Design a protein around this nucleic acid. Sequence first.
RNA 1: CCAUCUAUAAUUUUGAAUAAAAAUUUUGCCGUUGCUAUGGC
Lengths: 35, 139, 391, 24
Amino acid sequence: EITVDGLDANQVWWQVKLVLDSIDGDLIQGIQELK
Amino acid sequence: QTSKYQATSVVNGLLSNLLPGVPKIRGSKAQLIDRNLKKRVQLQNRDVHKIKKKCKLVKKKKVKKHKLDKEQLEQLAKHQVLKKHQHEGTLTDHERKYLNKLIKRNSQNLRSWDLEEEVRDELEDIQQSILKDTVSTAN
Amino acid sequence: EFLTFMNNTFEFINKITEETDVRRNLRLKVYSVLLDETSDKKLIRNIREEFGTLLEGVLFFINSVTTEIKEILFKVLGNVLQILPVDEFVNAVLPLLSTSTNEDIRYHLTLVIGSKFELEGSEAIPIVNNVMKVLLDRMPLESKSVVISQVILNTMTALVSKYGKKLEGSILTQALTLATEKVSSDMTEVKISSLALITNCVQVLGVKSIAFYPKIVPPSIKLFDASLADSSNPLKEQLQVAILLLFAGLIKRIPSFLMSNILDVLHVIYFSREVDSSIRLSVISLIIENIDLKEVLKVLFRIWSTEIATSNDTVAVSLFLSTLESTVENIDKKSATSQSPIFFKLLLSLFEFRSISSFDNNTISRIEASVHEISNSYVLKMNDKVFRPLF
Amino acid sequence: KKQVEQRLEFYLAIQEAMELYNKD
RNA sequence: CCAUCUAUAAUUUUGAAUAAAAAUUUUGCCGUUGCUAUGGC
């Protein structure tokens, strides 16, 4: 989960970076297969 | 006073895991400033990585000795349950196989002493010829 | 008379229990029953039950002891402890904890449980999980006793420290939850144990501990401020190093989350009077190598104008010099050019330090000399275009 | 002979915690 | 190295006093023998 409670956005932002970066790799391969 | 020792020890232990080199818990101001600045460079040069390696190895040796102690002790214990089971005919499938392996193990070993067949083929020829004369017995 | 017989009486229990042949050794006999499959499980339970009584009895005597008889009991106790596996020991001792009505005996039982695991490996992962659930469950019950509370907190610290990651997550997240609550405990002993766990818990959880970030850093900064005021505490030095060492732990595990509150972190390092300089200087080396330098450079200016410039503390000033100098040789050329206006703004403040400095000439002269060499480093590693306006 | 003589001469943690608890 | 600046030490003010504070300026080891001197390795 991405927590937005008692955190500044720079904390909130990066925790998006980790998930988004990791999901980018799996997202890219899925796009290639569906194409 | 137990709390003092316990409080020190938890702090003492945690220091090592994160800060190995730092010592443990137990005049002109210009002098003080320079000494701290000199302290900055020398600690930067400290070979902390070597310090971690020594602590790891010392602990690694201690655990390894105990694991061997457990291993040796269990192997001894594993033998008696076989002895009592064998004497009482309480052998399971497993025991009847390990002993069967021992039957194999010893039997293969004695073959090396028993010597090969081809020499027996010639040795027996030499053997019988010695015997007939010394016993004689033709008469 | 009576005591001499008791001295002789415990010589027996040592002699028989002493592990001096398969058949003589008590310890070996136990294992064969456990190893033997046809052994009745009820018989195994009796071994576990009889032992909880045996272990409790020896602890009772040791608790209620006479130096020569005290040591013999430990020989008896040591022989006792090695009789049965870690596996059956935990099963036979965990349910004695709740039953035991003496704070002393419970105090003793927690200590022995740890040392069973001080030399174990991954084979105890299922067992430790049982232990952690039990120890956590006992926490509300034993909050009244500080010593029992302190030690049990210490035990999880060793066990979270050792193969804590292999432990199932809910225990880790649960354990972090209990520690944060216990940080507010009035007893300094409960605190220092609470901080130590969170270090290990945060060390293992890492980013996953972010959910607890509001419940650790902001309180910890507040605790440090209270720490300065209450200088009479005998455990002030241990309390302070825990707070610093708490930041040090997470300065390696969550640098960028701590980036925003880095200013409070540096504030703790500067004014932590009790802690040794080496510890404070050491954790500084962690900050530079782990947290982005540009944000530090922005922060160094604010802390200097606010507190350090008026602090009149030699240690704080010296360490600030160490921090600020440390950044400049390590900061990149691109970062240096971008962050130049703040540094020069700080540099002017540093130059004006002589006006407000309450120290003697010798220190200020030395301080300026440090201020000048670093400035030479910073102006180098830049281009004309950025500097010409600044000049 | 004495000159020879001089030449001849020339050539547990829990237990600690348990004990510590008994003190207090 | 010299000078300068600090440090250490000494006289002085408030001060029962602590305290601050201006101010100024015989052995490596082991004994014996006094309150200083010499025996052994």
